[PDB]
């Protein structure tokens, strides 16, 4: 399976959530996940990104990242002798309608 | 005196069918968990086998992938043995978990086995419960895997697989029949001595299965060599055994130790408590052994000893004879050819017994919501579908365009942009309404038109589905999630849909290789099957904004290219059990769905076996295509081959015709909405039960195409009737093969037979309400409704109730509103036409007040009591009946006369005692008020002119139901007791106070009292009979209207004085609280907002002191509690208080009633509800129709009449 | 020479930890199946309640959303009783499925319950295995929710809530220690005789816990008024029981028929 | 029945500790302690020991 999900702002986080959901379903045994945010057009134009522990600034200080992770059910990774780095015990979310 | 023997079979039995059946079972939980965990053990054990084996073992993911290879005979011995054990144990578990059969015991049963039945029987014989048997089942599965691996290995070492085997694993055993086993051994010995074969591969007598039958096994080549020297009267066959067993010369104790070495050592291994009967061994019945020991003995029997089925029967009989029973009842499980067992075993010992298969405890009815299958494997239901396909801006227009058969190739779009690649376009794409979506008149261009079309189609689909936000558990605000699948057109597409509609839940913009919309649909159905949401809004999209003669020719001569097509769809999905309970307009149901991103042929069989259907059941198939000739050709040929079996001799096996169709030619290809468009076509075909003619013959008919139509696969281009099979059901496929792959198949279905709950609605009158968010939209909606009525003027007698139910209780009611009431559709049509003419004449429509209206209730006195009070209300409404029953229950236990009969019979009112009359009056008022409150009528003030005041106290929350009932009943009882009837009376006149005092003899308070200052022009006086007649004579002398009131006991006079202290005593017990809402007390004649004014003296004051309205209402209006806008609703057996309040504030105020002697109660109810609705009240409608199932059916009404405008 | 007695508890025993622990359980098929099916029947029977009762019931998807309300105490009797019964049945099923304990047998066992568990005792007292008990368990859950709804409604009819309700539900029972049962009953008789209360509002004895301790129930304000009379050494506590039960002057056989109506007749 | 002891197995019974001795006090005083319950679980089959893939 392959997908390119994006909901509103947590596209990568939602993708990871659904990857773990599929793993718990048994659809797949491994998953490659992790979104990207590299800009293409500079479009650079105020003279501030984010003040030290405050909100006096107007910008958001946007950045770039191309992170990507691997995923397995812990019993399988343990039975395969791989470099387990961490774990995701459980995940939940809502939409905060209000 | 019956014993039941559980018998397990051998590898001879074919368990493919049983394995598939168990994989299909979902109602049970233990079976599901066992079948889920079993493959894990299989994989774990298979992953520790020799290289030679692990190379050749299947490459699977679940148990579903093993049954077809098992059928093909291409499964190695280890997996075959493991699958046999899994099937046997699962079948046993199911029969005792969901079959509700008593678990065997040691006094009335025994277990047995032959080759693999030993392992399963040993596992069964220890545990005494289903739960205590699962881990032992898993251990037995692992042991079976190991045993099969070891036997396969020894066989492979002994003899090599042939070159011509061609995947299949040869057979190692053959049944021999016609000579006694002793003679067979003599002949095998002679043959061996003659040929001088190796002593480690000489044929051996595998088993003995009777006086004239047996089994012989060896390596396939030598076995065939030996069989060839068996003459004609020595018939022979081949059995599906793929390794050597029961070979004392091949295996030794080391082997049995190795195979059984997987069980860890311990000391609490369950013992064998139910006697397992084994016949090959010297000791018939074995019991009391530990689990590993019994397992090792079973494996030794399987691998070292020759099975002797000749003993089985007499061994069972001797076990029975020694236990005292008389007859044996076999319960064979996976035992091939078990019918002969019964008579054989019963022959030896004396026989008895008669069949007892009639249960008559077939099953215990399940609690509501319990019979449903697990949340997974629940047929999803399609509620509604809406689209805007090209040249047809509606669903029915599209169906017409399709059934007729017409291409949509267009030279240039009408008004998109300049001219100078051709394709099909949406004729109306830049049309949208901004006001309805609270958007600016100049911000529409900045919104992607695809987004606007998706919004429009989604709103229409939701409106047609009869789904209003947060009305029911299944359709709660939080349990709804959009699953739009976008494409590379160039986040907010689902975001705006969720935002404006106020829906909160998962939102996504799925995008895959090619199944952009169908993948989103698939995963939305997955979420529904998991419970993340209880409702979905899926839908594709396609719009072009910036830049192969046939319209994407359908596997014919020239189909090199394809024509891009524009389309948009939105569906409404919901779990079938959920939707069916909410009585929604079900259209079809999605049985299953699968995907494969590779393969082509096996996917359809996989899906069909998952759904448990045979190939011939399907009747139609759809295509998606991409535009390349190879793609469409492969699609067609693979689909037909996998769905059209060809007889081995050569003939048409697929009985019913299997039509094929593809939307590609009709409108083109959307590349993102193709799946949803095809599904929409399927829905239309199902609704109209008509297969459309096929288009695509232009310049070629592809009879050359391999496997197009050779045996009942007609594609006739003349619409053929497609009747629903009687008490049957249609079924359809939808393949979405694409060039990159992604072959997805989902099976549709005809909706179950609609419920038959006629229960003819008895209401005499009905209400139809319409709404809109703009005046032009309002007139358009009115015209559409009227036109629908005329075309539907004579459908049937039971249409108006359903029309009302749909237009009121299954729609969101906007701020511009109109309503019509009547008896039949003709009156509704006339009223709607009159309103339409009024509106178009020039008068604009203005929104109702922003928040809503304010109701000032009113409670009447006991002067309007009539026989059969609210009998119809008590008869229909469940809430009213329950309230009356409860109040009667309280009355009887409190030592007060029962009042239920006052409503049930309507005849006891003739001579009801005054106390009973007062009680039933109060309880009727109370129940009616509670009912009106249940219909969204929240009061803002109350007033009680008389005895009815007591109900007003509950209306304001000052008293409780029990407290008020006790107070009224106790007052009535004391009044009845202390004094006697025929002592006083009452008289009402219409005049001014000054006129009355001038024209009456004697000052007030001596010969007469002003009982109630009812109004500025009306007054009522009471006292003694002599004084009353004197007053009547005096007043009538001046030409003043007068009349005698029939009340026997004159309340609010001197008659109630002697019993005041007891009334105060009883009043001191009831708990008095602070009113929820202002109370207008005529007794004190002023507004009340504090409980301090309701001290126990209040009740005696009201009982004795005279009523006073004019002052009370004057104060009410003085504060501002009442004005010319508040609605006046009366709660009582007549419109009595309402006129008084009207004259108080003024005539312009609106007024209503709830009950009347002559007018049909529902007449007043519906009139009042319509006027409130027009006023803007958010009256709930669902509870109104809750008690009338006949009128509970949503209808297909005209879509919203949008006021479309063009942008960009 | 030994017998095991199975006893179930009433509404006093808090069931917030047990329900959460059962929700945590994932290694037992029967327990998870029962915990998934119970919400379905809960919603089904909860949808047949009167309009007012339904209006005051929280919206939920599964039990995980109910325990916070139970802990907070803003949970109505109708679903409180069903949740309690669900907790008891789930605990028993886990004990006798993953605990590998033989199902109780008439030879060497017997069952008992008090005020909630008499419902569960018959359910456990009929089936001979855990699998054969799940449908009966769901039937009992339905019966319990209906009984709680009926009792809540009668209570609401007798008396309403308060302006400072703040969601929380008042208590209807209080345990009294330091007085004999008969003496306390005589005290209540004297109290009612002194006042003049309707026969459906006088306080009454619900339980006689023993010669040294007893329980009395009444309406909230009436209960507090009566408790004000009880001096020392008598000690009084307020149990978390929200509706009037054990009242032989508020219910009759008709209500019993109404509650039992959820079980269709049959011979099986 | 004829027995001389009872083992309480309270489920969700508030204040259940006192119940034990209270019943025992009405029977012959031969409540042999024997407070032992061998409950060492049998080792699970390889692979299946893992908790079902759910969560």
3-state SS record for B826-855: HHHHHHHHHHHHHHHCCCCCCCCCCCCCCE
In whole angstroms, what is the distance from residue D52 CA to residue D55 CA? 8
In whole angstroms, what is the distance from residue A24 CA to residue B312 CA? 47
Token pair listed for C85: 């019964």
**Which residues have a Cβ under 8 Å from the Cβ of B408 and sit 6 or more positions away?**
B390, B391, B401, B424, B425, B551, B565, B666, B667, B668
In whole angstroms, what is the distance from residue C127 CA to residue C114 CA? 20
Token pair listed for B1205: 């405008």
Token pair listed for B83: 């699958």
Closest CA to B9 of B328, B334, B269: B334
Residue appearing with tokens 């961490």:
A86
CB-based contact (8 Å) between D36 and chain B? no
In whole angstroms, what is the distance from residue B117 CA to residue B123 CA? 10
Helix (H) or strand (E) run with residue B386 in it: strand B380-387
CB-based contact (8 Å) between B876 and chain D? no
Residue appearing with tokens 């029915």:
B396
Angle of helix C134-158 relative to helix C118-126, nearest 10 degrees, comes to 160
Confirm if B524 and B538 have CB atoms less than 8 A apart. Answer: yes
CB-based contact (8 Å) between C27 and chain D? yes
CB-based contact (8 Å) between C4 and chain D? yes
Give me the count of residues in chain C: 268
Decide the pairing of beta strands B327-330 and B173-177.
unpaired
Between the CA of residue A90 and those of A67, A87, B747, what are the distances in Å?
21, 9, 34
In whole angstroms, what is the distance from residue B82 CA to residue B46 CA? 10
Closest CA to B878 of B1183, B1155, B1187, B1162: B1187
Decide the pairing of beta strands B766-772 and B816-822.
antiparallel
φ, ψ of residue B540 in degrees (nearest 5): -90, -175
For residue A90, the chain D residues in CB contact (below 8 A) are: 55
User: What is the secondary structure of B220-262 as a DSSP string?
Assistant: HHHHHHHHTT--TTS-B--B---S--S-TTT--HHHHHHHGGG
Give the chain C residue whose CA is nearest to the CA of D48. Answer: C27
DSSP B568: -
Beta-carbon separation of B495 and A26 below 8 A: no
Residue appearing with tokens 């049954």:
B67
Give me the count of residues in chain B: 1208
Confirm if C124 and C6 have CB atoms less than 8 A apart. Answer: yes
3-state SS record for B945-962: CCCCHHHHHHHCCCCCHH
Closest CA to B464 of B1200, B1158, B1086, B1082: B1200
Rg of chain D, C-alpha, whole Å: 19
| Helix, coil or strand: residue B457 | helix
Beta-carbon separation of C37 and B369 below 8 A: yes
What is the dihedral sign for C-alpha B517, B518, B523, B527?
Answer: positive
For residue B131, the chain C residues in CB contact (below 8 A) are: 30, 97, 100, 130-131
* Size of the B and C interface in Cβ pairs below 8 Å: 133
User: What is the secondary structure of B791-837 as a DSSP string?
Assistant: HTTTS-TTSHHHHHHHHHHTS---SEEEEEEESSHHHHHHHHHHHHH
Closest CA to B1199 of B668, B433, B405: B433
In whole angstroms, what is the distance from residue B742 CA to residue B595 CA? 6
Decide the pairing of beta strands B1127-1128 and B1107-1108.
unpaired
What is the dihedral sign for C-alpha B338, B344, B349, B355?
Answer: positive
Substitution target from D48, D49, D51, D54 for chain B, most B beta carbons within 10 A: D48
Closest CA to B611 of B377, B785, B449: B377
Closest CA to C56 of C76, C84, C79, C40: C76
Task: Please report the residues numbered 959 through 978 in chain B whose beta carbons come closer than 8 angstroms to any beta carbon of chain C.
Answer: 960-963, 966
In whole angstroms, what is the distance from residue B227 CA to residue B184 CA? 12
In whole angstroms, what is the distance from residue B1019 CA to residue B1035 CA? 13
**Which residues have a Cβ under 8 Å from the Cβ of B471 and sit 6 or more positions away?**
B1182
CB-based contact (8 Å) between A73 and chain D? yes
Substitution target from D2, D3, D13, D17 for chain C, most C beta carbons within 10 A: D13
CB-based contact (8 Å) between D33 and chain B? no
Query: Which active-site residues of A does the annotation give?
Result: 9
In whole angstroms, what is the distance from residue C10 CA to residue C21 CA? 19
Closest CA to B714 of B625, B640, B820, B611: B640
Residue appearing with tokens 């990568």:
A12
Closest CA to B274 of B119, B111, B115: B111
| Helix, coil or strand: residue A29 | coil
Decide the pairing of beta strands B536-539 and B509-510.
unpaired
Confirm if B535 and B467 have CB atoms less than 8 A apart. Answer: yes
CB-based contact (8 Å) between B470 and chain A? no
In whole angstroms, what is the distance from residue B485 CA to residue B542 CA? 10
Helix (H) or strand (E) run with residue B941 in it: strand B939-943
φ, ψ of residue C111 in degrees (nearest 5): -125, 155
Beta-carbon separation of A6 and B478 below 8 A: no
Angle at C229 (CA atoms; ends C228, C234), nearest 5 degrees: 95
In whole angstroms, what is the distance from residue B58 CA to residue B56 CA? 7
User: What is the secondary structure of B95-116 as a DSSP string?
Assistant: HHHTS--PPP-SSSEEEE-SSS
Decide the pairing of beta strands B569-575 and B380-387.
antiparallel
Question: What are the residues facing C215 on neighbouring strands?
Answer: C175, C207
B1007: left (phi over 0), alpha (psi -120 to 50) or beta: alpha
**Which residues have a Cβ under 8 Å from the Cβ of B725 and sit 6 or more positions away?**
none
**Which residues have a Cβ under 8 Å from the Cβ of B191 and sit 6 or more positions away?**
B203, B226, B229
In whole angstroms, what is the distance from residue B699 CA to residue B702 CA? 10
Rg of chain A, C-alpha, whole Å: 18
Closest CA to B780 of B1206, B1200, B430: B1200
CB-based contact (8 Å) between A75 and chain B? no
For residue A2, the chain B residues in CB contact (below 8 A) are: 512-513, 597
Confirm if C247 and C204 have CB atoms less than 8 A apart. Answer: yes
| Helices and strands per DSSP (H, E), number in chain D | 1, 1
What is the dihedral sign for C-alpha B1113, B1118, B1123, B1127?
Answer: negative
Chains in contact with D, counting 3 or more C-beta pairs less than 8 Å apart as contact: A, B, C
Beta-carbon separation of D16 and C27 below 8 A: no
Beta-carbon separation of B367 and C267 below 8 A: no
Decide the pairing of beta strands B327-330 and B213-217.
unpaired
In whole angstroms, what is the distance from residue B222 CA to residue B200 CA? 12
Helix (H) or strand (E) run with residue B770 in it: strand B766-772
Confirm if B481 and B524 have CB atoms less than 8 A apart. Answer: yes
CB-based contact (8 Å) between C106 and chain D? no
**Which residues have a Cβ under 8 Å from the Cβ of B1071 and sit 6 or more positions away?**
B959, B960, B963, C159, C221, C222
φ, ψ of residue B381 in degrees (nearest 5): -115, 140
In whole angstroms, what is the distance from residue B1171 CA to residue B818 CA? 10
Residue appearing with tokens 């349990």:
B479
Task: Please report the residues numbered 346 through 365 in chain B whose beta carbons come closer than 8 angstroms to any beta carbon of chain C.
Answer: 360-365
Helix (H) or strand (E) run with residue B431 in it: strand B431-432
List the single residue in C1, C9, C32 with the smallest CB-CB distance to D12: C9
**Which residues have a Cβ under 8 Å from the Cβ of B177 and sit 6 or more positions away?**
B212, B213, B214, B234, B235, B236
DSSP B142: H
Q: Taking the C-alpha atoms of B792, B794, B795 and B801 in order, what is their torsion angle to the nearest 10 degrees?
A: 80
Between the CA of residue B691 and those of B660, B714, B716, what are the distances in Å?
9, 11, 10
**Which residues have a Cβ under 8 Å from the Cβ of B1112 and sit 6 or more positions away?**
B943, B1080, B1081, B1082, B1085, B1086
For residue A7, the chain B residues in CB contact (below 8 A) are: 491, 494-495, 506-509
CB-based contact (8 Å) between B269 and chain D? yes
Buried b (16+ CB within 10 A) or exposed e, C52-63: ebeeebeebbeb
List the single residue in C61, C129, C139 with the smallest CB-CB distance to B103: C129
CB-based contact (8 Å) between D51 and chain C? yes
Beta-carbon separation of A97 and B502 below 8 A: yes
CB-based contact (8 Å) between B500 and chain C? no
CB-based contact (8 Å) between B139 and chain D? yes
Give the chain B residue whose CA is nearest to the CA of D51. Answer: B37
| Helix, coil or strand: residue B1109 | coil
List the single residue in B45, B135, B141 with the smallest CB-CB distance to D44: B135
Cβ-defined contacts of B293-296 (< 8 Å, 24+): B294/B122, B294/B125, B294/B126, B295/B119, B295/B122, B295/B123, B295/B139, B295/B140, B295/B143, B295/B260, B295/B263, B296/B256, B296/B257, B296/B260
Give me the count of residues in chain A: 98
Confirm if C129 and B103 have CB atoms less than 8 A apart. Answer: yes
Is the bond leading into C174 cis (omega within 30 degrees of zero)? no
Token pair listed for B971: 């007052």
Substitution target from D2, D11, D15 for chain C, most C beta carbons within 10 A: D11
Question: What are the residues facing C112 on neighbouring strands?
Answer: C7
Beta-carbon separation of B138 and D40 below 8 A: no
Query: Please, what's the largest Cα pairwise distance for chain B?
Result: 150
Residue appearing with tokens 């200080």:
A61
Token pair listed for B211: 């006086």
CB-based contact (8 Å) between D44 and chain A? no
| Helix, coil or strand: residue B608 | helix
Question: What are the residues facing B244 on neighbouring strands?
Answer: none
Helix (H) or strand (E) run with residue B175 in it: strand B173-177
E-assigned strand segments in B107-147? 109-112
Closest CA to C56 of C134, C156, C191, C177: C156
Confirm if B316 and B5 have CB atoms less than 8 A apart. Answer: yes
Confirm if B1031 and B1007 have CB atoms less than 8 A apart. Answer: yes
Query: Please, what's the largest Cα pairwise distance for chain A?
Result: 54
Between the CA of residue A12 and those of B494, B512, D55, what are the distances in Å?
17, 15, 21
**Which residues have a Cβ under 8 Å from the Cβ of C70 and sit 6 or more positions away?**
C15, C16, C19, C80, C83
Beta-carbon separation of D46 and B266 below 8 A: no
Give resolution, Å, one decimal: 3.4
DSSP H helical ranges for chain A? 11-25, 74-80
For residue A5, the chain B residues in CB contact (below 8 A) are: 508-511
In whole angstroms, what is the distance from residue B573 CA to residue B571 CA? 6
CB-based contact (8 Å) between D50 and chain A? yes
Beta-carbon separation of B491 and A1 below 8 A: no
Q: What is the distance between the terminal CA atoms of chain B, rounded to a whole angstrom?
A: 90
* Size of the C and D interface in Cβ pairs below 8 Å: 68
In whole angstroms, what is the distance from residue B779 CA to residue C89 CA? 60
For residue A6, the chain B residues in CB contact (below 8 A) are: 491, 508-509
* Size of the A and B interface in Cβ pairs below 8 Å: 47
Hey, how many other C-beta atoms are within 10 angstroms of the C-beta on B736? 25
Task: Please report the residues numbered 1035 through 1094 in chain B whose beta carbons come closer than 8 angstroms to any beta carbon of chain C.
Answer: 1065-1066, 1068-1069, 1071, 1073-1074
Decide the pairing of beta strands B1018-1024 and B1127-1128.
unpaired
For residue C7, the chain D residues in CB contact (below 8 A) are: 8-11, 13, 16, 19
Closest CA to C219 of C247, C193, C181: C247
In whole angstroms, what is the distance from residue D55 CA to residue B661 CA? 43
Hey, how many other C-beta atoms are within 10 angstroms of the C-beta on B717? 14
Hey, how many other C-beta atoms are within 10 angstroms of the C-beta on C253? 7
Confirm if C138 and C37 have CB atoms less than 8 A apart. Answer: yes
Buried b (16+ CB within 10 A) or exposed e, B655-694: eebbbbbbbbbbbbbbbbbbbbbbbbbbbbbbbeebbbbb
**Which residues have a Cβ under 8 Å from the Cβ of B442 and sit 6 or more positions away?**
none
Hey, how many other C-beta atoms are within 10 angstroms of the C-beta on A72? 17
Beta-carbon separation of A24 and D50 below 8 A: no
Beta-carbon separation of B509 and A26 below 8 A: no
- How many alpha carbons fall within 13 Å on the CB side of residue C33? 24
Closest CA to B809 of B572, B571, B472: B472
User: What is the secondary structure of chain C as a DSSP string?
Assistant: --EEEEEE--TTS--HHHHHHHHH--S-HHHHHHHHHHHHHHHHHHTTS-HHHHHTS---SSGGGTHHHHHHT---HHHHHHHHHHHHHHHHHHHHHTS-PPPP-TTSEEEE-SSSSHHHHHHHHH-SSSGGGHHHHHHHHHHHHHHHHHHHHHHHHH----TT-TTPPPP-EEEEESS-HHHHHHHHHHHHHHS---TTTS-EEEEEEETTEEEEE--HHHHHHHHHH--SS-EEEE-S--S--S-TTT--HHHHHHHHTTS-----
Residue appearing with tokens 């030592």:
B895
Residue appearing with tokens 């568990």:
C117
CB-based contact (8 Å) between D55 and chain A? yes
Confirm if B28 and D29 have CB atoms less than 8 A apart. Answer: no
Beta-carbon separation of A75 and D55 below 8 A: no
């Amino acid at each position: 399976p392959s997908y390119t999900i994006d909901t509103a702002c947590s596209s990568s986080l939602a993708a990871l959530h659904m990857a773990c959901n599929a793993l718990w379903r048994g659809e797949v045994d491994t998953a490659i996940v992790g979104g990207t945010n590299v800009l293409t057009n500079p479009d650079m134009t105020r003279s501030g990104n984010c003040k030290t522990f405050d909100d006096e600034a107007d910008g958001y200080c946007r950045g770039e990242a191309v992170v990507t992770l691997i995923l397995k059910r812990l019993p399988d990774a343990q039975a395969d002798k791989d470099p387990i780095q961490a774990s995701i015990l459980g995940i939940a979310t809502n939409h905060s309608a209000e | 005196a019956q014993m039941r023997v559980v018998a397990f079979g051998d590898q001879t039995y074919d368990c493919s069918e049983a394995v598939s059946q168990l994989l299909r079972v979902r109602d049970d939980a233990i079976v599901v968990d066992f079948l889920e965990r079993a493959p894990a053990v299989l994989k774990a054990e298979l992953a520790r086998l020799s290289s030679e084996q692990q190379e050749e073992t299947p490459r699977f993911a679940t148990l579903a992938e093993l049954v077809p290879r098992y059928r093909a005979g291409t499964l190695n011995p280890a997996v075959s043995q493991a699958l046999t054990c899994i099937a046997q144990l699962g079948l046993f578990i199911r029969q005792h978990s969901s079959g509700q059969e008593a678990y065997p015991t040691a006094h009335d049963s025994c277990i047995t086995g032959v080759c693999t039945g030993a392992l399963t029987a040993v596992a069964v014989g220890s545990a005494s419960s289903v739960t205590a048997l699962v881990p032992l089942a898993l251990h037995t599965v692992a042991v079976a895997v190991r045993l099969g691996a070891r036997a396969w290995e020894i066989g492979s070492c002994l003899a090599d697989a042939r070159r011509g085997a061609n995947g299949r694993y040869a057979s190692w055993t053959s049944a021999v029949g016609g000579i006694s086993p002793q003679d067979l051994q003599d002949r095998i010995s002679a043959y061996t001595a003659e040929q001088a074969l190796a002593s480690v591969s000489v044929p051996y007598l595998s088993a003995a299965v009777g006086p004239g039958q047996s089994s012989v096994s060896a390596a396939p080549v030598i076995l065939d060599a030996f069989l060839s020297t068996l003459l004609r009267p020595l018939t022979t066959t081949r059995l599906p055994i793929t390794a050597p067993y029961h070979a004392p010369h091949l295996f030794t104790a080391k082997d049995v130790q190795h195979v059984t070495d997987c069980l860890p050592p311990s000391e609490a291994w369950p013992t064998v408590r139910i006697p397992i009967i084994s016949f090959s061994r010297d000791e018939a019945v074995s019991r009391g052994a530990s689990f590993p020991a019994a397992m090792s003995e079973a494996v030794r029997d399987c691998l070292i000893r020759p099975i002797a089925l000749d003993r089985m029967a007499v061994s069972i009989a001797n076990h029975a004879r020694d236990l005292g029973k008389d007859s044996v009842l076999p319960s064979p499980i996976a035992l091939s050819f078990s019918d002969k067992l019964g008579p054989q075993v019963n022959s030896h010992l004396p026989g008895a017994k008669a069949p007892t298969p009639e249960l008559t405890s077939k099953s215990i009815p399940s609690a509501i919501g319990a019979e449903q299958q697990p949340m997974a494997k629940s047929p999803i239901a399609i509620l509604a579908a809406s689209g805007r396909f090209p040249q047809s801006s509606s669903m029915d227009q599209f169906w017409d365009v399709l059934i007729n058969g017409v291409d949509t190739h267009e030279l240039v779009p009408p008004t998109r942009w300049n001219a100078a690649g051709f394709g099909c376009w949406l004729h109306e794409a830049g049309e949208f309404d901004a006001a309805y979506f609270n958007m600016s008149p100049r911000e529409a261009p900045q919104v992607d038109p695809a987004q606007r079309l998706a919004l429009l189609t989604a709103t229409e689909a939701l409106e047609q589905a009869g789904v209003v936000p947060n009305r029911t558990s299944s359709t709660q605000k939080n349990r709804v999630g959009v699953w739009y699948g976008a494409t590379s057109n160039d986040a907010f597409i689902p975001g705006r849909v969720n935002y404006f509609h106020k829906f909160s839940g998962p939102s996504y913009t799925i995008d895959t290789a090619c199944s952009s919309s169908l993948a989103a649909l698939h995963m939305a159905c997955n979420a529904l099957w998991r419970g993340e949401v209880d409702t979905a809004i899926v839908g594709g999209t396609n719009v072009l904004t910036n830049p192969r003669s046939g319209n994407c020719k359908t596997f014919d001569d020239e189909a090199d290219g394809y024509c891009r097509g524009e389309a948009v769809v939105t569906l409404i999905l919901k779990r079938l059990p959920d939707a069916q309970a909410d009585k929604d307009p079900i259209q079809a149901s999605i049985l299953g769905i699968a995907t494969n991103h590779s393969a082509q042929q096996d996917l359809f069989q996989q899906v069909l076996t998952e759904t448990g259907l045979t190939a011939n059941d399907i009747s139609v198939c759809e295509m998606a295509g991409t535009g390349t000739q190879a793609g469409d050709s492969g699609e067609t040929t693979s689909v037909v081959e996998t769905l059209a079996p060809l007889n081995r001799s050569g003939s048409a096996v697929r009985t019913t015709p299997l039509y094929i169709g593809a939307v590609k030619s009709n409108v083109g290809h959307a590349e993102s909405a193709a799946g949803v468009s095809s599904l929409a076509k399927i829905l239309l075909m199902l609704k109209h039960s008509k297969i459309p003619p096929h288009v695509g013959i232009k310049t070629k008919l592809n009879h050359r195409l391999p496997d197009l139509a050779a045996r009942n696969t007609h594609i006739a281009r003349s619409e053929v009737p497609w009747p629903r099979p009687k008490n049957g059901k249609r079924r359809v496929l939808l393949n979405n093969f694409s060039a990159a792959g992604g072959n997805t198949c989902l099976v549709l279905e005809d909706a179950p037979e609609p419920e038959d709950s006629q229960e003819v609605d008895p209401r005499e009158h009905h209400i139809v309400a319409l709404s809109a968010k703009t005046p032009d939209s309002m007139v358009n909606n009115l015209t559409n409704m009227i036109t629908w009525i005329d075309k539907h003027s004579g459908d049937s007698l039971a249409t108006l109730p359903q029309l009302s139910y749909t237009t009121t209780a299954r729609r969101v009611h906007h701020r511009h509103r109109a309503v019509a009431t009547g008896t039949d559709l003709l009156q509704i049509r006339s009223s709607l036409q009159e309103q339409l003419d009024r509106r178009v004449s020039g008068e604009r429509s203005i929104p109702h007040p922003p928040n809503g209206p304010s109701f000032v209730l009113a409670f009447t006195g006991q002067g309007s009591a009539f026989a059969g009070m609210g009998v119809d209300l008590y008869k229909r409404f469940a809430s009213f009946r329950s309230d009356i029953a409860r109040y009667d229950q309280i009355c009887e236990g409190m030592s007060l006369p029962s009042i239920k009969a006052m409503f049930e019979d309507e005849k006891v009112f003739s001579t009801a005692s005054p106390t009973l009359q007062q009680l039933t009056h109060v309880c009727f008022q109370m129940a009616l008020y509670r009912l009106w409150k249940s219909l969204g009528v929240q009061a803002k003030a109350v007033v009680g002119h008389a005895l009815g005041e007591y109900a007003a106290l509950y209306a304001a929350g000052v008293l409780s139901q029990s407290d008020t009932l006790y107070l009224v009943g106790r007052r009535a009882q004391l009044m009845e007791k202390h004094l006697s009837q025929g002592t006083h009376a009452m008289l009402a006149v219409r005049a001014k106070e000054e006129a009355i005092v001038a024209a009456i003899d004697g000052p007030p308070g001596e010969a007469y009292e002003f009982s109630c200052r009812n109004g500025e022009q009306r007054n009522v006086l009471g006292g003694t009979v002599a004084q009353i007649q004197a007053a009547k004579a005096a007043l009538e002398a001046k030409k003043i209207r007068c009349q005698y009131l029939d009340t026997p006991m004159a309340f609010h006079t001197g008659q109630v004085d002697p019993i005041l202290p007891e009334l105060l005593q009883v009043a001191a017990a009831c708990s008095i609280q602070d009113p929820q809402i202002p109370v207008i007390s005529p007794a004190y004649g002023k507004v009340i907002r504090s409980a301090k004014d309701f001290q126990p003296e209040y009740f005696t004051h009201h009982c004795r002191s005279s009523v006073n309205m004019v002052d009370a209402l004057q104060s009410a209006v003085e504060e501002g509690l009442l004005d010319k806008n508040v609605i006046g609703l009366e709660i009582g057996p007549g419109p009595v208080v309402t006129q008084f309040v009207k004259e108080a504030v003024g005539t312009t105020m609106q007024t209503f009633a709830s009950i009347n002697k002559d007018k049909d109660t529902w007449q007043l109810m519906t009139q009042a509800l319509a006027k409130f609705y027009l006023a803007g009240a958010s009256v709930e409608w669902s509870r109104y129709h809750e008690d009338f199932p006949g009128a509970q059916k949503v209808l297909e009404l005209p879509a919203y009449g949008w006021a479309l405008k063009n942008y960009w």
